[PDB]
Amino acid sequence: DLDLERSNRQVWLVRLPMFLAEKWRLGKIRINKSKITLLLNEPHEYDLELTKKVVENEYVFTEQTIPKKTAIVGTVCHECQVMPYHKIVEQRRNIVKLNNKERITTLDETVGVTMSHTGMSMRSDNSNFLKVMPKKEILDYLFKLFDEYDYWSLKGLKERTRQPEAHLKECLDKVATLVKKGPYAFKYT
Amino acid sequence: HDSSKLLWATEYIQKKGKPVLVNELLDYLSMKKDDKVIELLKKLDRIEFDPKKGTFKYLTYDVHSPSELLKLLRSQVTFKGISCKDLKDGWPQCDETINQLEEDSKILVLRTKKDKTPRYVWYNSGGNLKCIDEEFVKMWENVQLPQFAELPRKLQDLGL
């Protein structure tokens, strides 16, 4: 249900410097009739150039196959760009060219301690990581499991009855037939 | 369940190994006094039930004589074949009769003399031929046949 609200709204696009833009992440624009500036709050004033006068085929929309809620804002009216105590800003721009990284630290110890911690040091573990019957009663219980379901694997029966497995195998080789193939493979019925 | 009483009754009458009275069978099983077990026993053809008094017969195979063995062999030509279990359960110690049934009267394959010998039940004519000396067999395997059409030419030169 996309609906255009107005589009009649006129918006101006601005390419700001990084410190003031990240600061915006209020002032008063002074329109001087073909030169306009900006008086921020205490602080600098900024001349904004008429970057592109005619700016058609450019608009602004917002969002509230998968259709989503779409709303139209307004047309772009003028392409602009903010231009800039400037010595402090120039010094900050010279100052940003001083980024460095930390160098490799040299362990200054007596070596024998670190070399002792290298190979065998008689110290293991210290950290958890990648450490990971009567036949008649058994027959009656097997017939109860058959009452629950006729088809069961022998291993599953060994995991349900919980007892010595030899006696259970002997109890399965008397009253139940072992199917080896088909969908009920390796199962007594 | 009553089915465990049915299979337990059949395994018990197989432990007996001889026909007994139905009432005596119900008395030997103590608490198994159900008639549905008797009816399911009448429906079972594995243990034949004779309506005269109490008689329970056991089939795999009624073969217990060498003649019946020969007939059961003749009923397997151009088909398949059974195993050892049915014969050794129908008649105790069949391997003795196999050793007594000389020259293709009862064949088998001796595999291992420690695992009851997995047997075999087929028939032919002679099959013995152990009079052939081992030296003649060794001289028979050392002959390398000339492959392709060299053999018919080598036999036409000798006159055969």
UniProtKB/Swiss-Prot annotation, chain A:
Output the Gene Ontology terms for molecular function.
DNA binding; nucleotide binding; RNA polymerase II complex binding
Recorded GO CC terms:
nucleus; transcription factor TFIIF complex
Family, as annotated = Belongs to the TFIIF beta subunit family.
Q: What is this protein called?
A: Transcription initiation factor IIF subunit beta
Cite a single GO BP annotation: regulation of DNA-templated transcription
* Additional observations: Present with 520 molecules/cell in log phase SD medium.
Query: Which UniProt keywords are given for this protein, alphabetically ordered?
Result: DNA-binding, Nucleotide-binding, Nucleus, Phosphoprotein, Transcription, Transcription regulation
Q: Specify the superkingdom.
A: Eukaryota
Q: Does the keyword Nucleotide-binding apply?
A: yes
Its annotated compartments are:
Nucleus
**Quaternary context:** TFIIF is composed of three different subunits: TFG1/RAP74, TFG2/RAP30 and TAF14.
What's this chain's function? TFIIF is a general transcription initiation factor that binds to RNA polymerase II. Its functions include the recruitment of RNA polymerase II to the promoter bound DNA-TBP-TFIIB complex, decreasing the affinity of RNA polymerase II for non-specific DNA, allowing for the subsequent recruitment of TFIIE and TFIIH, and facilitating RNA polymerase II elongation.
Q: Parent protein range shown? A: 58 to 350 of 400
* Species this chain originates from: Saccharomyces cerevisiae (strain ATCC 204508 / S288c) (Baker's yeast)
UniProtKB/Swiss-Prot annotation, chain B:
Write down the DNA-binding region ranges: 1-64
Where in the cell is the protein located? Answer: Nucleus
According to the UniProt entry, the coiled-coil residues are none
Q: Which domain of life is it from?
A: Eukaryota
What does the record note on quaternary structure? TFIIE is a tetramer of two alpha (TFA1) and two beta (TFA2) subunits.
- Return the similarity comment: Belongs to the TFIIE beta subunit family.
Which additional comment does the entry carry? Present with 1150 molecules/cell in log phase SD medium.
Task: Sum up the protein's function in the record's words.
Answer: Recruits TFIIH to the initiation complex and stimulates the RNA polymerase II C-terminal domain kinase and DNA-dependent ATPase activities of TFIIH. Both TFIIH and TFIIE are required for promoter clearance by RNA polymerase.
Could you tell me what this protein is called? Transcription initiation factor IIE subunit beta
Native source organism of the sequence: Saccharomyces cerevisiae (strain ATCC 204508 / S288c) (Baker's yeast)
- Covered range within the whole protein? 123 to 283 of 328
